[PDB]
Scaffold this active site. Structure first.
Site, PDB file in Angstrom:
ATOM      1  N   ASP A   1       4.535  30.680 -14.857  1.00 40.28           N
ATOM      2  CA  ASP A   1       5.582  31.596 -15.308  1.00 40.28           C
ATOM      3  C   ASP A   1       6.678  31.551 -14.207  1.00 40.28           C
ATOM      4  O   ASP A   1       6.434  31.019 -13.114  1.00 40.28           O
ATOM      5  CB  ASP A   1       4.998  33.021 -15.477  1.00 40.28           C
ATOM      6  CG  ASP A   1       5.952  34.085 -15.992  1.00 40.28           C
ATOM      7  OD1 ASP A   1       6.969  33.724 -16.627  1.00 40.28           O
ATOM      8  OD2 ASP A   1       5.695  35.268 -15.749  1.00 40.28           O
TER       9      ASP A   1
ATOM     10  N   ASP B   1       9.249  34.511 -13.416  1.00 43.25           N
ATOM     11  CA  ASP B   1       9.271  35.855 -12.840  1.00 43.25           C
ATOM     12  C   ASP B   1       7.888  36.323 -12.386  1.00 43.25           C
ATOM     13  O   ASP B   1       6.931  36.298 -13.170  1.00 43.25           O
ATOM     14  CB  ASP B   1       9.894  36.841 -13.821  1.00 43.25           C
ATOM     15  CG  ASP B   1      10.388  38.122 -13.176  1.00 43.25           C
ATOM     16  OD1 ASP B   1      11.359  38.053 -12.373  1.00 43.25           O
ATOM     17  OD2 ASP B   1       9.833  39.192 -13.496  1.00 43.25           O
TER      18      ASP B   1
ATOM     19  N   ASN C   1       9.993  33.570 -20.294  1.00 45.69           N
ATOM     20  CA  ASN C   1      10.732  34.489 -21.131  1.00 45.69           C
ATOM     21  C   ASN C   1      12.000  34.718 -20.333  1.00 45.69           C
ATOM     22  O   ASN C   1      11.957  35.329 -19.262  1.00 45.69           O
ATOM     23  CB  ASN C   1       9.953  35.803 -21.390  1.00 45.69           C
ATOM     24  CG  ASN C   1       8.970  35.742 -22.547  1.00 45.69           C
ATOM     25  OD1 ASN C   1       8.751  34.701 -23.165  1.00 45.69           O
ATOM     26  ND2 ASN C   1       8.332  36.857 -22.859  1.00 45.69           N
TER      27      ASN C   1
ATOM     28  N   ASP D   1       1.938  36.725 -14.267  1.00 44.96           N
ATOM     29  CA  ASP D   1       1.756  38.028 -13.626  1.00 44.96           C
ATOM     30  C   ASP D   1       1.566  39.151 -14.684  1.00 44.96           C
ATOM     31  O   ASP D   1       1.215  40.280 -14.316  1.00 44.96           O
ATOM     32  CB  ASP D   1       2.944  38.353 -12.693  1.00 44.96           C
ATOM     33  CG  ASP D   1       4.297  38.410 -13.378  1.00 44.96           C
ATOM     34  OD1 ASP D   1       4.519  37.622 -14.323  1.00 44.96           O
ATOM     35  OD2 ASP D   1       5.141  39.224 -12.957  1.00 44.96           O
TER      36      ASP D   1
ATOM     37  N   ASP E   1      21.822   4.283  13.643  1.00 47.12           N
ATOM     38  CA  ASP E   1      21.801   2.899  14.121  1.00 47.12           C
ATOM     39  C   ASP E   1      23.196   2.240  14.004  1.00 47.12           C
ATOM     40  O   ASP E   1      24.131   2.781  14.576  1.00 47.12           O
ATOM     41  CB  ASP E   1      20.639   2.141  13.412  1.00 47.12           C
ATOM     42  CG  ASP E   1      20.466   0.720  13.844  1.00 47.12           C
ATOM     43  OD1 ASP E   1      19.942   0.510  14.937  1.00 47.12           O
ATOM     44  OD2 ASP E   1      20.953  -0.183  13.120  1.00 47.12           O
TER      45      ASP E   1
ATOM     46  N   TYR F   1      17.006  -9.459  21.467  1.00 47.24           N
ATOM     47  CA  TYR F   1      16.983  -9.742  20.032  1.00 47.24           C
ATOM     48  C   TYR F   1      18.415  -9.895  19.458  1.00 47.24           C
ATOM     49  O   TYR F   1      18.588 -10.637  18.502  1.00 47.24           O
ATOM     50  CB  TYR F   1      16.195  -8.650  19.292  1.00 47.24           C
ATOM     51  CG  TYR F   1      16.929  -7.328  19.217  1.00 47.24           C
ATOM     52  CD1 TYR F   1      16.894  -6.431  20.276  1.00 47.24           C
ATOM     53  CD2 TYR F   1      17.715  -7.004  18.111  1.00 47.24           C
ATOM     54  CE1 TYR F   1      17.585  -5.226  20.222  1.00 47.24           C
ATOM     55  CE2 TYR F   1      18.429  -5.814  18.055  1.00 47.24           C
ATOM     56  CZ  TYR F   1      18.354  -4.921  19.111  1.00 47.24           C
ATOM     57  OH  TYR F   1      19.051  -3.739  19.090  1.00 47.24           O
TER      58      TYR F   1
ATOM     59  N   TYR G   1      26.214  -7.857  13.775  1.00 41.14           N
ATOM     60  CA  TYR G   1      25.963  -8.236  15.184  1.00 41.14           C
ATOM     61  C   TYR G   1      26.813  -9.393  15.682  1.00 41.14           C
ATOM     62  O   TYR G   1      26.782  -9.718  16.878  1.00 41.14           O
ATOM     63  CB  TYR G   1      24.502  -8.693  15.342  1.00 41.14           C
ATOM     64  CG  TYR G   1      23.458  -7.626  15.141  1.00 41.14           C
ATOM     65  CD1 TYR G   1      23.004  -6.861  16.212  1.00 41.14           C
ATOM     66  CD2 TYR G   1      22.848  -7.447  13.905  1.00 41.14           C
ATOM     67  CE1 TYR G   1      21.969  -5.942  16.055  1.00 41.14           C
ATOM     68  CE2 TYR G   1      21.828  -6.520  13.730  1.00 41.14           C
ATOM     69  CZ  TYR G   1      21.405  -5.753  14.804  1.00 41.14           C
ATOM     70  OH  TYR G   1      20.409  -4.828  14.613  1.00 41.14           O
TER      71      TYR G   1
ATOM     72  N   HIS H   1      12.480   4.679  16.368  1.00 41.36           N
ATOM     73  CA  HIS H   1      13.763   4.183  15.870  1.00 41.36           C
ATOM     74  C   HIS H   1      14.119   4.594  14.424  1.00 41.36           C
ATOM     75  O   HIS H   1      15.289   4.812  14.142  1.00 41.36           O
ATOM     76  CB  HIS H   1      13.870   2.647  16.053  1.00 41.36           C
ATOM     77  CG  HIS H   1      15.169   2.095  15.523  1.00 41.36           C
ATOM     78  ND1 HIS H   1      16.362   2.298  16.197  1.00 41.36           N
ATOM     79  CD2 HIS H   1      15.432   1.471  14.352  1.00 41.36           C
ATOM     80  CE1 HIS H   1      17.298   1.769  15.429  1.00 41.36           C
ATOM     81  NE2 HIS H   1      16.786   1.266  14.307  1.00 41.36           N
TER      82      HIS H   1
HETATM   83  C1  6NX Z   1      17.881  -2.706  15.338  1.00 37.21           C
HETATM   84  N1  6NX Z   1      18.871  -1.839  15.938  1.00 37.21           N
HETATM   85  C2  6NX Z   1      20.060  -2.305  16.448  1.00 37.21           C
HETATM   86  O1  6NX Z   1      20.249  -3.467  16.772  1.00 37.21           O
HETATM   87  N2  6NX Z   1      21.010  -1.312  16.572  1.00 37.21           N
HETATM   88  C3  6NX Z   1      22.303  -1.543  17.181  1.00 37.21           C
HETATM   89  C4  6NX Z   1      23.278  -0.460  16.738  1.00 37.21           C
HETATM   90  C5  6NX Z   1      24.618  -0.646  17.421  1.00 37.21           C
HETATM   91  C6  6NX Z   1      24.472  -0.630  18.932  1.00 37.21           C
HETATM   92  C7  6NX Z   1      23.494  -1.692  19.416  1.00 37.21           C
HETATM   93  C8  6NX Z   1      22.158  -1.588  18.702  1.00 37.21           C
END
Ligand code: 6NX
Ligand code: 6NX
EC number: 3.3.2.10
Lengths: 546, 546
Positions: free
Chosen positions: B8, B10, B123, B184, B334, B382, B465, B523
């Site tokens: 219900d 109410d 209702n 109720d 990020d 990386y 990147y 992260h």
């Molecule tokens: C996987 N994360 C990554 O490479 N982030 C970047 C965001 C901008 C600044 C450097 C790292």
């Protein structure tokens, strides 16, 4: 020969000039003449103002530097600045007071419509003030009407430096002799002139526009009232919501503020609201212009029952649910106008306010079949023609261009008669194969409707007329109710089907009903009288919808 | 055996019960006990309240009928109603005071997660009061969590009439013995019991939930803190804006209020914000969760330069222009966090407020190549691996499921080391072929990312990147600026790449910076600690963004 027109922002496309506020402030505070304008330009190319205009620093960072320049200037002039002298206050006021110079924008609009490349070239700043939104709104409104916007703070260059003028020419892909450049600052006009550009010193708008029309050979002054801004389908945000497994609804979205859901009629499109979408967004609303079920990019299932008011209304509630909207103002026209009264009747908690163009609210007669009712009105004959599945689809789908050109006509252009449609055996039997183009539409606008209707045709749209008994039974459940939420009825003088007198008894059901009325307006309200539709809707929205 | 649970509204899913306000009003006004509740139920099945609950009349039409019933009752009781007695005031207050009974919704959520069909049977009335939005919001929030919502005023039937119970069973496609029904009102529970349904009389929530868990065999009381509501991709409104001829941006949209633009990181999706989207919409915001350029349904051109910050930022401004938004609050994570600081620096007039998860604002070092800077940090190795066009694409695209399962892991689950990635010749060289499923994600959620990345792969995302020198040169133009608009920095304790200490000098550039910090968070902030991200963002939004 001219093919490009360049406009300054301050004192040209926007008035009053922010520069003119410094002089007005001097006069109001009885400070020495030029003290504020001299502190503003202090250090010239090396000064704080050039740094601001080039984008090196933001407006908030500049404010204390301007304050120090004002102290230095007052010290030299052997004068004292007042007790509560604030540069922030002066500029906040100057900026909010500055509005679009409408006749200047109109002339820019006209030159662009006549084939010119148009641009705004401005010495501006990176605005990070708490009240920066006001300017953002202004720039947003103005920029949309131009091919380019060149901002000094973005290009790291400033007028009168020669490089910004060479940057301008490169952006335009034009030789200087092909460009008109309009500025209120003679010093900033000088480098354009020196390059061979046609220059106009803007003091009063009328004189500038006289010089502009004389030099371009295009009428800019005393021109007729222009149409509102329309929509370019490819420049809009397109939205898609699945309301049930086989049903997806498409919409166009523009603006921020209270949600305003626009519902078109038969046989139309979200595009039927092209003249209202930019106006209502500019007025402070979030517009959602629908492709109603059976149309354009919205799903079009074949089943007749998929188009009864009960299901159409429930799916519109689901549409709000999925978008996360507790309410929307519902504005409908024609079949959309009917849907909108039913939303107000069955889902008032979801409807902020309701407005209908042409379509009145007439409650189901429980003592009479909807077939009997439709038969009783000669102008509703075409609705009986629409009943047999396939018959109206075959005529309406045979030649799409002919269908829309024949239908979409102003009251003084009509090629169709809605009486004896069954007897004649069609809507277009006494209509030409190649109808002339109505004053309301361009060939391109007809072609957008032609392309939309190539996807699903007329089955789904015609099914809106094929639920009389179903709609009647559902409407009968609401016979003891009243519409007590904000409501607007807009009648069109020359709509010979949805006549203004058909709305005469509405206050019996809607006691607080507000009204609008458009003279010399046919059935296609939005494109027939766009300027007046916008004025009526905006006035009602700001008073009754918030 | 039970497979359906009915609640219900109410006094069950919403508290305090609107009925309990009538008794409280009697006590406060010192009126005879039961006078208000007796006037409310006056005429029973034939009375005004049944007409209201069946949908024959609206709430506003009922108010004066309730007033007349109250006069009639007071007359019989030989008492007088106060000087300024108002039914409207009483019900406006009752309705606004009524809130969701959170532990009851949690139990409904849990039963549904365990395979039950859930429904709200109520209702209720057609609310046309000026303040109807409050209830609309409540219903909108509650309904989303249930398979069905059955409202008396919509079905023209009312509890305790036997037909509504048979209607309920038909909607559920369940035999009565498979249903738990919670109410109720004992009188409204009686017909469900009589049909063979398991019934629970709800007085206090804890006892009702004890009865409910005993009868279902599912833990509902003392259960761990549940995750926030997530998003089902097919139930969202999907938006599409063309920002330039070859570039279209996709977004998910939910809610009304100030625009909040969510910007994901690498290699993610609008879906990375699944836990924030419903929470921020519920908090009073219009959420726009982007598929950033190169991802999901957004365009992914091959050219590296299409992904430099300058173009990404300009396209985000165009995105606002086309949607008709003068501003948005920009929230990034990020790579999205980096974009968001650059929006605040270069376009402060368009940014209402700025927030970043994990990504600090570190200004370009003009005396050092970005290559030198990245080389100086071992955890950034990386990024050098990401430089060569094709190399990281080949490893990341080889097995999509493996890519996301390996990447999307909590701090205590890590299978990847970001140091010596080049030397090792890959991100996954020391990673299993079939990684285990992280506690943060289901198999289905991994599969949504797998399906998204099948469209354009990793070229566009990796190109984010590949613009170091371009970004550095553009960022150098902003070295004299400060971020003076509302700003929030959210650090994650266990992000071993974007470490909290990398943000330590931010107040030098952002003096009024506000902060948030999440303990035991890696992260993948949004899915790692969704509840805490929501709390930090909502608190900051309501205080700094409005
Ligand atoms: C996987 N994360 C990554 O490479 N982030 C970047 C965001 C901008 C600044 C450097 C790292
Ligand atoms: C072409 N117009 C049309 O048939 N409109 C209908 C709207 C609903 C009420 C009857 C007329």
């Amino acid at each position: 020969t001219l093919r490009a027109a360049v406009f300054d922002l301050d004192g040209v496309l926007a008035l009053p000039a922010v520069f003119g506020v410094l002089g007005r402030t001097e006069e109001a505070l009885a400070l020495p003449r030029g003290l504020l304008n001299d502190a503003f330009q202090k250090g010239g190319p090396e000064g704080a103002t050039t740094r601001l205009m080039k984008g090196e620093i933001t407006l908030s960072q500049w404010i204390p530097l301007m304050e120090e320049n004002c102290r230095k200037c007052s010290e030299t002039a052997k004068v004292c600045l007042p007790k509560n002298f604030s540069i922030k206050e002066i500029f906040d006021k100057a900026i909010s007071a500055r509005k679009i110079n409408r006749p200047m924008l109109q002339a820019a609009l006209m030159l662009r419509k006549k084939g010119f490349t148009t641009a705004i070239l401005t010495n501006t700043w990176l605005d990070d003030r708490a009240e920066r939104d006001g300017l953002a709104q202004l720039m947003c409104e103005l920029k949309m009407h131009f091919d380019f916007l060149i901002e000094s703070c973005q290009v790291g260059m400033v007028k009168p430096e020669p490089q910004i003028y060479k940057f301008l020419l490169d952006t335009l892909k034009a030789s200087p002799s092909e460009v008109v450049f309009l500025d209120d600052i003679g010093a900033n006009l000088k480098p354009a002139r020196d390059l061979g550009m046609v220059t106009i010193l803007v003091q009063d708008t009328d004189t500038a526009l006289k010089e502009l029309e004389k030099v371009t050979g295009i009428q800019l002054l005393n021109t007729p009232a222009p149409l509102p801004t329309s929509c370019n389908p490819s420049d809009m945000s397109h939205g898609y919501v699945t309301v049930k497994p086989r049903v997806r609804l498409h919409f166009v979205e523009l603006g921020s503020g209270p949600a305003v859901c626009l519902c078109h009629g038969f046989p139309e499109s979200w595009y039927s609201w092209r003249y209202q979408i930019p106006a209502l967004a500019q007025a402070g609303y979030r517009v959602l212009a629908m492709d109603m079920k059976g149309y354009g990019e919205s799903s079009a299932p074949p089943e007749i029952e998929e188009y009864c008011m009960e299901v159409l209304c429930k799916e519109m509630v689901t549409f709000l649910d999925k978008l996360g909207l507790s309410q929307a103002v519902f504005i409908g026209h024609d079949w959309g106008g009917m849907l909108v009264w039913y939303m107000a009747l069955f889902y008032p908690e979801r409807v902020r306010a309701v407005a209908s163009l042409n379509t009145p609210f007439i409650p189901a007669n429980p003592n009479m079949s909807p077939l009997e009712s439709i038969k009783a009105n000669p102008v509703f004959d075409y609705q009986l023609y629409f009943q047999e599945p396939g018959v109206a689809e075959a005529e309406l789908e045979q030649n799409l261009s002919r269908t829309f050109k024949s239908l979409f006509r102003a009251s003084d252009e009509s090629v169709l008669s809605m009486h004896k449609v069954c007897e004649a055996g069609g809507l277009f039997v006494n209509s030409p194969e190649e109808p002339s183009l109505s004053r309301m539409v361009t060939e391109e606008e007809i072609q957008f409707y032609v392309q939309q209707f190539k996807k699903s045709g007329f089955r789904g749209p015609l099914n809106w007329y094929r639920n009389m008994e179903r709609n009647w039974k559902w409407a009968c459940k609401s016979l003891g109710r009243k519409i007590l939420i904000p409501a607007l009825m807009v009648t069109a003088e020359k709509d010979f089907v949805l006549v203004p007198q058909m709305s005469q008894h509405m206050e019996d059901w809607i006691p607080h009903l507000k009204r609008g009325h458009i003279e010399d307006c046919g059935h296609w309200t939005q494109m027939d009288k766009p300027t007046e539709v916008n004025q009526i809707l905006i006035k009602w929205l700001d008073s009754d919808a918030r």
